[PDB]
Nucleic acid binder design. Structure first.
Lengths: 53, 53
RNA sequence: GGGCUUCACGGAUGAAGCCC
RNA sequence: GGGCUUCACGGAUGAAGCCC
């Protein structure tokens, strides 16, 4: 795993076409921004496992 | 972009081979954990352009 | 503008509630 | 466990400083 400590308002990248922005804190929550083309998928842990239903 | 608001300790998934956990928050910063195979790249925005120089 | 919480298979720098 | 800040091309559940 590649752990990083990104400042709010900045971003991270993956592959050559993906970006993972950090919009900021939300208390015990955090608002992240996953940016990828529709060529790939993006879901949360409590919803990916909800598909097998 | 697909914005979401996760809690600390939860996670996100991408490309069916990548997992993006939220390890926690640190004031103006956040700690994320990019889990991807070494078959693909992952770099921060402030150093993706550092490679180009 | 700030703090906390909740909703959201949602592709949008998402949404709603409480307090100052 | 909680609050603030700084250093990290680093694939590691990264690092350092101040306070309870």
């Amino acid at each position: 795993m590649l752990i990083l400590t990104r400042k709010v308002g900045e971003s991270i990248n993956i592959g050559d076409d993906i970006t993972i922005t950090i919009l900021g804190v939300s208390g015990q929550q955090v608002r992240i921004g996953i940016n990828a083309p529709k060529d790939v998928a993006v879901h949360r842990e409590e919803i990916y496992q909800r598909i097998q239903a």
